[PDB]
Amino acid sequence: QDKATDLQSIQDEISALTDEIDGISNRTEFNGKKLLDGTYKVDTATPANQ
Amino acid sequence: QDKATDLQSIQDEISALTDEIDGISNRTEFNGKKLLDGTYKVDTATPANQ
């Protein structure tokens, strides 16, 4: 029922909320630690970098 | 949780207390005897110098 125009609008909203989620995973610099850096603690199936 | 910066600070403190401990083992010049010279009375597993 909606249009590509309307869904372009919603998609603008979802990119806003998107970079807000990157915002949570980034702004969480606790004592300088980007803890919600997904990189910070990945098991990686190796002890190369955890 | 701490940083290499913070632990550099604590390490400065532990070097201060360190040279304080050398301070105890050195300043104890009783009648001129650095008694807490660890050198002064080592058994050494020999009578070479005790």
**Cβ separation B2–A31 shorter than 8 A:** yes
The three-class DSSP label of residue A18 is: helix
Say which DSSP state A43 is in: -
Q: State CA A9 to chain mean position distance.
A: 20
Residues of A in contact with B1 (CB under 8 A): 31, 33
CA distance A5 to chain B (A): 48
Resolution value in angstroms: 4.5
- CB neighbours (10 Å) of residue B36? 16
- Report the distance separating Cα A49 and Cα A31, nearest Å: 21
Buried b (16+ CB within 10 A) or exposed e, B10-32: eeeeeeeeeeeeeeeeeeeeeee
Task: Give whole-number Cα distances, A24 to A11, A33, A37, in Å.
Answer: 19, 13, 9
Distance CA A34, CA A38 (A): 9
Buried b (16+ CB within 10 A) or exposed e, A6-44: eeeeeeeeeeeeeeeeeeeeeeeeeeeeeebeeeeeeee
